[PDB]
Scaffold this motif. Structure first.
Motif, PDB file in Angstrom:
ATOM      1  N   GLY A  83       0.666  -1.210  -0.114  1.00 33.17           N
ATOM      2  CA  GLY A  83      -0.026   0.141   0.063  1.00 33.17           C
ATOM      3  C   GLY A  83       0.816   1.375   0.009  1.00 33.17           C
ATOM      4  O   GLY A  83      -0.130   2.415  -0.139  1.00 33.17           O
ATOM      5  N   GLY A  84       2.112   1.258  -0.008  1.00 34.03           N
ATOM      6  CA  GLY A  84       2.926   2.635  -0.083  1.00 34.03           C
ATOM      7  C   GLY A  84       3.453   2.874   1.085  1.00 34.03           C
ATOM      8  O   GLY A  84       4.131   3.850   1.393  1.00 34.03           O
ATOM      9  N   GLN A  85       3.800   1.638   1.905  1.00 31.44           N
ATOM     10  CA  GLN A  85       4.310   2.008   3.071  1.00 31.44           C
ATOM     11  C   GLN A  85       4.709   0.751   4.041  1.00 31.44           C
ATOM     12  O   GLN A  85       4.299  -0.413   3.924  1.00 31.44           O
ATOM     13  N   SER A  86       5.845   1.194   4.650  1.00 33.71           N
ATOM     14  CA  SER A  86       6.195  -0.149   5.641  1.00 33.71           C
ATOM     15  C   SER A  86       5.952   0.100   7.034  1.00 33.71           C
ATOM     16  O   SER A  86       5.522   1.334   7.521  1.00 33.71           O
ATOM     17  N   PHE A  87       5.950  -0.879   7.709  1.00 34.73           N
ATOM     18  CA  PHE A  87       5.571  -0.829   9.373  1.00 34.73           C
ATOM     19  C   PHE A  87       6.597  -1.637  10.006  1.00 34.73           C
ATOM     20  O   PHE A  87       7.262  -2.617   9.560  1.00 34.73           O
ATOM     21  N   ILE A  88       6.758  -1.290  11.484  1.00 31.83           N
ATOM     22  CA  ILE A  88       7.616  -1.969  12.292  1.00 31.83           C
ATOM     23  C   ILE A  88       7.109  -2.529  13.229  1.00 31.83           C
ATOM     24  O   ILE A  88       6.221  -2.129  13.864  1.00 31.83           O
ATOM     25  N   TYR A  89       7.474  -3.735  13.430  1.00 35.31           N
ATOM     26  CA  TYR A  89       6.780  -4.552  14.545  1.00 35.31           C
ATOM     27  C   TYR A  89       8.183  -4.959  15.635  1.00 35.31           C
ATOM     28  O   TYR A  89       8.767  -5.527  15.462  1.00 35.31           O
ATOM     29  N   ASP A  90       7.565  -4.212  16.803  1.00 33.84           N
ATOM     30  CA  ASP A  90       8.875  -4.065  17.726  1.00 33.84           C
ATOM     31  C   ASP A  90       7.979  -4.461  19.315  1.00 33.84           C
ATOM     32  O   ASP A  90       7.398  -3.412  19.625  1.00 33.84           O
ATOM     33  N   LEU A  91       7.958  -5.552  19.505  1.00 33.09           N
ATOM     34  CA  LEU A  91       7.317  -5.904  20.840  1.00 33.09           C
ATOM     35  C   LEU A  91       7.813  -5.108  22.314  1.00 33.09           C
ATOM     36  O   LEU A  91       7.050  -5.171  23.126  1.00 33.09           O
ATOM     37  N   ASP A  92       9.078  -4.401  22.206  1.00 29.52           N
ATOM     38  CA  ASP A  92       9.713  -3.823  23.073  1.00 29.52           C
ATOM     39  C   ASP A  92       9.442  -2.209  23.048  1.00 29.52           C
ATOM     40  O   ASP A  92       9.825  -1.595  23.754  1.00 29.52           O
ATOM     41  N   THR A  93       8.649  -1.743  21.802  1.00 28.73           N
ATOM     42  CA  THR A  93       8.414  -0.156  21.707  1.00 28.73           C
ATOM     43  C   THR A  93       7.165   0.037  22.654  1.00 28.73           C
ATOM     44  O   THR A  93       6.065  -0.731  22.902  1.00 28.73           O
ATOM     45  N   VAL A  94       7.185   1.191  23.107  1.00 32.22           N
ATOM     46  CA  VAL A  94       5.926   1.800  23.592  1.00 32.22           C
ATOM     47  C   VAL A  94       4.872   2.662  22.369  1.00 32.22           C
ATOM     48  O   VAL A  94       4.100   2.958  22.708  1.00 32.22           O
ATOM     49  N   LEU A  95       5.567   2.619  21.356  1.00 25.05           N
ATOM     50  CA  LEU A  95       5.052   3.087  20.113  1.00 25.05           C
ATOM     51  C   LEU A  95       3.985   2.023  19.868  1.00 25.05           C
ATOM     52  O   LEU A  95       4.218   0.845  20.276  1.00 25.05           O
ATOM     53  N   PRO A  96       3.055   2.260  18.893  1.00 24.51           N
ATOM     54  CA  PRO A  96       1.860   1.073  18.591  1.00 24.51           C
ATOM     55  C   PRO A  96       2.707  -0.051  18.046  1.00 24.51           C
ATOM     56  O   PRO A  96       3.599  -0.100  17.380  1.00 24.51           O
ATOM     57  N   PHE A  97       1.881  -1.158  17.977  1.00 30.77           N
ATOM     58  CA  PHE A  97       2.518  -2.424  17.451  1.00 30.77           C
ATOM     59  C   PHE A  97       1.431  -3.076  16.426  1.00 30.77           C
ATOM     60  O   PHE A  97       0.208  -3.612  17.130  1.00 30.77           O
ATOM     61  N   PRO A  98       1.529  -2.932  15.220  1.00 33.83           N
ATOM     62  CA  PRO A  98       2.797  -2.231  14.536  1.00 33.83           C
ATOM     63  C   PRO A  98       2.795  -0.668  14.407  1.00 33.83           C
ATOM     64  O   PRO A  98       1.828  -0.058  14.830  1.00 33.83           O
ATOM     65  N   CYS A  99       3.837  -0.335  13.942  1.00 32.21           N
ATOM     66  CA  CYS A  99       3.997   1.024  13.941  1.00 32.21           C
ATOM     67  C   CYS A  99       4.315   1.469  12.480  1.00 32.21           C
ATOM     68  O   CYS A  99       5.262   1.095  11.851  1.00 32.21           O
ATOM     69  N   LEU A 100       3.873   2.676  11.904  1.00 28.06           N
ATOM     70  CA  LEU A 100       4.440   2.911  10.821  1.00 28.06           C
ATOM     71  C   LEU A 100       5.821   3.430  10.833  1.00 28.06           C
ATOM     72  O   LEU A 100       6.578   3.888  11.810  1.00 28.06           O
ATOM     73  N   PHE A 101       6.539   2.710   9.707  1.00 29.37           N
ATOM     74  CA  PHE A 101       8.082   3.043   9.564  1.00 29.37           C
ATOM     75  C   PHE A 101       8.378   4.489   9.961  1.00 29.37           C
ATOM     76  O   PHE A 101       9.471   4.455  10.537  1.00 29.37           O
ATOM     77  N   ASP A 102       7.863   5.397   9.049  1.00 31.22           N
ATOM     78  CA  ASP A 102       8.540   6.781   9.333  1.00 31.22           C
ATOM     79  C   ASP A 102       8.194   7.380  10.870  1.00 31.22           C
ATOM     80  O   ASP A 102       9.314   7.720  11.520  1.00 31.22           O
ATOM     81  N   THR A 103       7.511   6.746  11.620  1.00 33.12           N
ATOM     82  CA  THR A 103       7.004   7.371  12.959  1.00 33.12           C
ATOM     83  C   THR A 103       7.990   6.674  13.715  1.00 33.12           C
ATOM     84  O   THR A 103       8.602   7.212  14.743  1.00 33.12           O
TER      85      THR A 103
END
Length: 195
Positions: A83-103
């Motif tokens: 869809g034009g977009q990467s996402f990061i899955y980091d179980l150790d982040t306080v950001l959302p799971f998953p998180c937009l790559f740029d964020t």
């Protein structure tokens, strides 16, 4: 693509042991392989480290609100969606799971420009199929001199392959001549996957 469906279960349902991020990411890759939602070819394991094995990452569960945590290495899952977009899955982040790559790059990684050079971040990006094929860890790096466990190991058997029972150092290494995948500077990594 704004209706992105996660490639994994929600955070609380994923296999997780603290300080075994390499395995936590392996288990995410295995889940994706075993389901029919996304091609495994769209997914990467990403090791973050550097020569001194001292990398800051912000927005981390181990120290909320007052980052960074300085890791020896950290591993996350990257999904490049159609869809034009990467996402990061980091179980150790306080950001959302998953998180937009740029964020994730803006808030968890941040610029290296004013970071002391020995703390700057490099990225080893391994296709998920290759990571599942080739990764092996006997967990021996987590047992001290005594020899006690630094953190409790996961309950399922060690990940091993026919070729190796232990090659974690070849993934933590940011030497492009070593191991699998490709090693990128922060600038090259964001150029490749950033929107």
């Amino acid at each position: 693509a704004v209706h992105y469906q996660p490639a994994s279960p929600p955070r609380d349902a994923c296999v997780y042991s603290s300080c075994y991020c390499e395995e936590n990411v392996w288990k995410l890759c295995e889940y994706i392989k075993n389901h029919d939602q996304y091609p495994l070819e769209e997914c990467y394991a990403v090791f973050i480290s550097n020569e001194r094995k001292m990398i800051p990452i912000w927005k981390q569960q181990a120290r909320p609100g007052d980052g960074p945590v300085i890791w020896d290495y950290h591993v996350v899952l990257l999904h490049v969606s159609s869809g034009g977009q990467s996402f990061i899955y980091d179980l150790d982040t306080v950001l959302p799971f998953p998180c937009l790559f740029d964020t994730y790059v803006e808030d968890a990684i941040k610029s290296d420009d004013d970071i002391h050079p020995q703390f700057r971040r490099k990225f080893r990006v391994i296709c998920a199929d290759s990571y599942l094929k080739n990764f092996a860890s006997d967990r021996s790096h987590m047992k001290d001199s005594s020899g006690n466990w630094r953190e409790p190991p996961p309950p399922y058997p060690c990940i091993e392959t026919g070729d190796s029972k232990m090659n974690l150092n070849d993934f933590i290494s940011m030497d492009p001549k070593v191991g699998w995948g490709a090693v990128y500077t922060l600038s090259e990594f964001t150029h490749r996957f950033g929107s």
